[PDB]
Design a protein around this nucleic acid. Structure first.
Lengths: 46, 46, 46, 46, 46, 46, 46, 46, 46, 46, 46, 46
DNA sequence: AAAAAA
């Protein structure tokens, strides 16, 4: 009496493979305010 | 004194084979609001 | 003893093809508050 | 005067064995926003 | 020994063609509280 | 065999024209806590 | 062979004219928790 | 064919007159954490 | 040809007088999580 | 025509007497991060 | 002309004695996310 | 007239024993940004 | 908001 849920794992494993894609696109934008955070500290201490 | 009910099981086993067909057509539409439910959460947390 | 449910899959596969259309129209509006979320952080840290 | 309900437990034990399958497919997608939640905190504190 | 049911399909195919008309008139009113739902979020985050 | 649904679109197009009216009355009250949010930041930084 | 249904429209047009009366009496009570919802937000942000 | 709904407006106008009473009892308790929020800032800056 | 419905209003006016009794017993339990909701906010801000 | 609701107030007055018990058990745990919040400030200023 | 309803109270007093059993099994699982909610706050404030 | 709820406590006591497992796996990752938070303060003060 | 910054 089953219902075919084969279209579930095919849909959301491709879903969770897309959460990883837009996680790496944020990490690449948070290191901008990490690098610029501490080369401001070099100019101030000088 | 029987009445031929051979046209019953031929009619509703093909009936319950059609309930399964339109059950799988709903599951394929509920995973749309499951995937889009949690890639909205990635954009908000970023 | 079947009932023609051929008008079902023709109606809701075109239905679930429309849920995808208005999912992509929301993702295009959530990245506005993702980009503007972290170019506010550049102005504050400066 | 019983009615054979042997097709019940054969149908829904296979049903509840499928709820477990799509529960583990969600847990694998909620840990994405748990890991990315706190490696954002490392970049901000730096 | 039939009864003419030709006035049935002429009456309810025009009936179900009217359910579609007042379905599209609701969708045009639910996007008002979808758009205004997330331009409130832009003003709050600012 | 139709039923006159001409009183539907006359009733809810005037309905959705009123959702827009009380959406603009909220936007005018959320910019108060947007402007006052960042002229507090000028006084604190001084 | 008709039956006089003139007492129908005289009874329920006055009925639907009363649903409008107690709809406007609820809207006047939901704006209390809309106004007080966002003057709490002014006190918290201060 | 009406039903006397005169006991409705007599019941909920006195209802919405009570929502205002317990709204003003919260505002009097949120200004405590507004005043104490910024006389802590005077002691810290000193 | 009436039927004595004098036992109706004697039964449900005493019924609706009891809905008011267990409404006031809930309001006395929802103010517990209103008071404790915002004296937690005083300890956190300190 | 009443129904005995004497088991209601006996059940939820003992219910709301238990919400007070686990409210005081949280307040005793939020003062830990209030005291330790500002004896960290003494060590830093030294 | 009664019908023996002695099997009613024997069936549902044992029923409501089982609602209490699975209420206490939830309370034991909600305190896990209460304790872990505020020992995360100690690590963040440090 | 009971229903065997013996499969409830066997299922969720093993459930709440798993919430504790993934609570301790987060605490081990929040002390990373507690230790690194204050050995950054040693390098800055030097 | 605190910690960065004075």
């Amino acid at each position: 009496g089953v219902i075919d849920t084969s279209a579930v794992e095919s849909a959301i494993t491709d879903g969770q493979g897309d959460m990883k894609a837009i996680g790496g696109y944020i990490v690449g934008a948070l290191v901008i305010l990490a690098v610029a955070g501490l080369i401001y500290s070099m100019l101030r201490k000088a």
